[PDB]
Amino acid sequence: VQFKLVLVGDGGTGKTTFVKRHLTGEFEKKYVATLGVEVHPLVFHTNRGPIKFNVWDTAGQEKFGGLRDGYYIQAQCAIIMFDVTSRVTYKNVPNWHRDLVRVCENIPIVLCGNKVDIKDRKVKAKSIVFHRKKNLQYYDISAKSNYNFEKPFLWLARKLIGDPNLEFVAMPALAPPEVVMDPALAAQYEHDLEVAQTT
């Protein structure tokens, strides 16, 4: 049985494109009229059994202001997203985290910089600092290529289940990649995060 996960971040960062990679979750999503939300059931399969994240994706209302308390309430974990091609979206991460922690004081949170498939990257590893003092794990992701798609969910499942060595035994069916994540760029970016972390 299951965990509410709230996916937040500026409009246009790729939240909806990311949750939709999980094809069953997209097929089985439940639209909640009263709340302005689609709830996608993303089941994943660990070496210890299944875990279900019910991922709350907005219906775009973040473009007009903050989300209502009912969106965040009873969340057990979260993903904050920004877009590595837009510094302003990164600049706004602290405010999203504040809103989230205001309603859900002690939950595990992953920070994700999306669209790392785009060659002209504006927010690089050296610049991504917010997660350090706040105890968040960070990953680069590219929703459109499934790059690192399972990373945030695996880190969350380890935190939520209380098993640091949990692994996924099989991947969910994901929408086939719509863009190629350049494998060279992926390897440099993962190492660049490791370097920034040691600096």
Ligand X SMILES: Nc1nc2c(ncn2[C@@H]2O[C@H](COP(=O)(O)OP(=O)(O)O)[C@@H](O)[C@H]2O)c(=O)[nH]1
Tell me the β-bridge partners of 3.
Answer: 53
What residue 175 binds from Mg ion, ligand X, none (CB within 5 to 8 A, per partner kind)?
A: none
Shortest Cβ distance from residue 166 to ligand X (Å)?
26
Is 70 annotated for ligand binding? no
Specify the stretch interacting with ligand X by CB under 6 A; choose among 15-23, 32-40, 47-55, 92-100.
15-23
The number of angstroms, rounded, from the C-alpha of 128 to the middle of its chain's C-alpha atoms is 15
Instruction: Give the residue among 138, 152, 142 at the shortest CA–CA distance from 93.
Output: 138
Q: Does 140 bind ligand X (CB under 6 A)?
A: no
Residue (35 or 193) nearer to Mg ion, CB: 35
Q: Does 24 bind Mg ion (CB under 5 A)?
A: no
Q: After which residues is the chain discontinuous, taking C to N > 2.5 Å?
A: none
Which of 46, 54, 142, 148 binds ligand X (CB under 6 A)? It is: 142
Pairing of strands 37-46, 3-9: unpaired
For residues 52 and 5, the answer to whether their CB atoms sit within 8 Å is: no
What's the one-letter identity of residue 158?
R
The interface with ligand X within residues 176-195 (CB under 6 A) comprises 179
Q: Does 16 bind Mg ion (CB under 5 A)?
A: yes
